[PDB]
Amino acid sequence: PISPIETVPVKLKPGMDGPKVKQWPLTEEKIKALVEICTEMEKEGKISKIGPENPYNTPVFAIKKKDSTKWRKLVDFRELNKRTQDFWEVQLGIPHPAGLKKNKSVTVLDVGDAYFSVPLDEDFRKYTAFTIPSINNETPGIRYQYNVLPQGWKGSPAIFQSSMTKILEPFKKQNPDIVIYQYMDDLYVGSDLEIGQHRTKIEELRQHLLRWGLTTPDKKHQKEPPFLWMGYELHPDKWTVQPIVLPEKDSWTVNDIQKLVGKLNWASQIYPGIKVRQLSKLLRGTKALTEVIPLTEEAELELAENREILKEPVHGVYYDPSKDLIAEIQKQGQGQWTYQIYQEPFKNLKTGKYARMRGAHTNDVKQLTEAVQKITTESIVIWGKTPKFKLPIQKETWETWWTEYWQATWIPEWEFVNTPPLVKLWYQLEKEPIVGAETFYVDGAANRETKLGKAGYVTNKGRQKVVPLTNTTNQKTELQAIYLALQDSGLEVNIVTDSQYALGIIQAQPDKSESELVNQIIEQLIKKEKVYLAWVPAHKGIGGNEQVDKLVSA
Amino acid sequence: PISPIETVPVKLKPGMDGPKVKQWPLTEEKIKALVEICTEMEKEGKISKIGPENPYNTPVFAIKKKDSTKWRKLVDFRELNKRTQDFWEVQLGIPHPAGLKKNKSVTVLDVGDAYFSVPLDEDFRKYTAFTIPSINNETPGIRYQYNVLPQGWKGSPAIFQSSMTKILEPFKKQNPDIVIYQYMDDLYVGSDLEIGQHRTKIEELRQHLLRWGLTTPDGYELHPDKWTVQPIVLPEKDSWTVNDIQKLVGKLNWASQIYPGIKVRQLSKLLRGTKALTEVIPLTEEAELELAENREILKEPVHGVYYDPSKDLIAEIQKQGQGQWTYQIYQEPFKNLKTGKYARMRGAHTNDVKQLTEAVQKITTESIVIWGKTPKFKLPIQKETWETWWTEYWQATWIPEWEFVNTPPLVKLWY
């Protein structure tokens, strides 16, 4: 009683043994309902009757209802998974429909009990062992162990795909014209053939599979226009996502959050900005699946933020290789960026929004530039090619930043588009000084001991100033000083500093920033005509820094 | 079929596991070609399909496009190379042909094809695992582990260093005034003069290698004589502005970090005051005396600077100019070994990354020929930027170590 498919060998993590966890007693009818489901699996050949000669174990719990409203089983493989070797579970993501073509016909098979049909390495089966808790504590618990790929297990997903590809390969060679896509219980079959010769090939595949032990039930899509594949709804002309709904509750368990974590991972691979960070942090402690864990302020907000993203439906058209790919981008407030990738004018394939913290101090076109890349890469993933870009910035405006910036930069084949939110360089620092303009020899310092410090100018015309600051640092003081120079000065001013740190932050021409002070300076700059920021060293014979940067500074 | 002593035992560095690097997306044209290349490599029995039980992975890609030669698959074994054990001796103690840098001409011929013969330790093969991707994740992914020595691997040229000396022995006997250095997949061949005979003697070695079983591709001209150093140059301002003296004295303070054979004094004494930048202040009779010590100890090599085979070489690059690019190589900070310039933006089209990439290679080859090693690069570019383009312009068989920097030399240190 064994399946023809060859079994992928599985070893544990080196130097690590298997799971030896105690089985926690459930209710009387929960226990009786477990035997009912397991007595089924022994006959089905999925598990085997095991004795006390086996040292390992794993927890067995039972959820109530979700599929056809009756009892279901659940095994806690958390420990085993940590002890189980790693796999190449990385597939470089999940596919995207705008990366699909127009297949005259299409059919989707649901691989039913796919996991429970692919076999497990005899040399591992002993680790997937589970003892059923006894109701009448006179009778010892009946031990079992999986013979086939367990539902909760780590390798199960990777292995199955592997098994599948191997089973799928022969048909795919005999039919290089047919597109066959797979992920979990889903199996997409598209074609060039007409319904007569298509429904045929489907039966040939459903038969090929049958031979290998895999089954596809009566309820297959049978070529119905709306196709449910990977949480999407594939309509003959366009595709929309299937609405993602999350559980709403006040009392949460380890299981249900594990679930929520899983379901959120699905979604992230569809929706941008979805985090699991805070919620998953609550999971870290090895608490039994049913013990109630309280959400943090972090987790609760995370829940709301995610649910918010999902409260935003997504759709689109399919890909036509014959035509060029165009991606257009737009600027928005708060560092929010939006993009639409299309083939025909208002028929978008994919739309998204970029938001990324490129440090404390940031420039605008530095963000745009980061956007192109995020898209480029991502479109290469989806289509095998880079798009023609439609960018809202003059050709002369970009030309001036790559020749002005110190870091190397490049943006592919791009065209200018006129949409209201335009990006530019608000200001431009001079390369050489201005004639006769007031030259502020600036300075600022502070002691960690006092936490306080001084800051202010001393010009060529004689003018001075100084201000004592409360809660500041040796560097933040050096910044505050340049602001002083900037404000108390004529529209055309020259400035001088000993802080390399500071000289750069301005040199980098920021649009906005995190720390208010910089923001303040930006304002000044945008308002000024010709500014010139120079630089000279600190504690030696420097002009102003001899008189301002004088010792015992307070 | 006796006792398995045909393959050399290779292990990973103690404690360390095998590479589990991820695969980055590739264009259709690229995957297409890789699929081809591997299926043949597959039939030739060179590589072998594996399942998911192999947790390891290394990235792959191809390199030749347009109207030049055919696509060359390249595996980035950098991680594995770092994880694989160095082999006791052979290259150590007795090493590098310090004459290589002085030849009128040097040619680099890829000989990685030669590794494909020798089989790899059965145990080690898993660590060479690599995956070919699919457009939009159509095909789960084509996994493969090498059965023979992998090209970009570091272990390969070592194991074969023996076989290669065997192969090179007649040519290095018949041609004594011809220096041949092997660096990983490449063979750097260089000779003192083009009597006309150079290009011929190359094609001769090609034939010879072709004879003894090495299928060198169906030729890069380097001339390490023109390789001059680019020193620090000071402005000849006719006793101009204060700013000048500022852009001067600042630069000289940085330069003291390299060598104190310069003084700050008199020019710093001309800075004493608060006189506006745009003031054409004349240079004093004591400051010209400071320019005689400055300009002197600038166009001359440093002190305490020697190549120490135990240390890693580091390279830093700067975008000094719309066309120009500058670089420096050292092992210990400020303890410089080489300083140069790259200005092939007038030749190749105006694209920065391409320029950078082309330069990275230029510097690295330049590094090999001189010290016989690749430098750890400090790259004046944003991670994500480089990561999405370098491959499209890469042409070498190797791939150096790299870091990303937020550029600090505010004085415009060279020119």
From Swiss-Prot, chain A:
Q: What is the effect of changing M184I?
A: 54% loss of polymerase activity according to PubMed:9533880; increases polymerase activity according to PubMed:9657675. No loss of RNase H activity
Give the result of L187A, as annotated.
76% loss of DNA-directed DNA polymerase activity. 60% loss of RNA-directed DNA polymerase activity
In the UniProt annotation, what is the result of changing S156A? 74% loss of polymerase activity. 56% loss of RNase H activity
What's the impact of mutating L187V? 22% loss of DNA-directed DNA polymerase activity. No loss of RNA-directed DNA polymerase activity
What result is annotated for mutating F227A?
A: No effect on RNA-dependent DNA polymerase activity. Complete loss of RNA 5'-end cleavage. No effect on RNA 3'-end cleavage
The taxonomic lineage of its organism, from the top, reads: Viruses, Riboviria, Pararnavirae, Artverviricota, Revtraviricetes
Region (RT 'primer grip') residue spans:
227-235
> Which positions does UniProt annotate for Mg(2+) 2 binding?
D443, E478, D498, D549
Reported effect of changing E224A?
No effect on RNA-dependent DNA polymerase activity. No effect on RNA 5'-end and 3'-end cleavages
Question: Which consequence is recorded for altering P226A?
Answer: No effect on RNA-dependent DNA polymerase activity. Complete loss of RNA 5'-end cleavage. No effect on RNA 3'-end cleavage
What is the covered span of the full protein?
600 to 1153 of 1447
Q: What is the effect of changing Y501W?
A: Almost no effect on RNAase H activity and replication. 6-fold resistance to inhibition by BBNH
- What organism does the record attribute this protein to? Human immunodeficiency virus type 1 group M subtype B (isolate BH10) (HIV-1)
Top-level taxon of the source organism: Viruses
Q: What is the effect of changing I167T?
A: 34% increase of DNA-directed DNA polymerase activity. 18% increase of RNA-directed DNA polymerase activity
- In UniProt terms, what is the effect of altering F440W? Slight delays in replication. Virions contain primarily p51 RT
According to the record, mutating E529Q results in: In strain: Isolate PV22
| Effect recorded for K512Q | In strain: Isolate PV22
Ranges spanned by the short sequence motif Tryptophan repeat motif, renumbered to the chain: 398-414
* Protein name in the entry: Reverse transcriptase/ribonuclease H
Impact when changing W401L: Almost complete loss of RT p66/p51 heterodimerization. Complete loss of polymerase activity
Residues forming the RNase H type-1 domain are 434-554
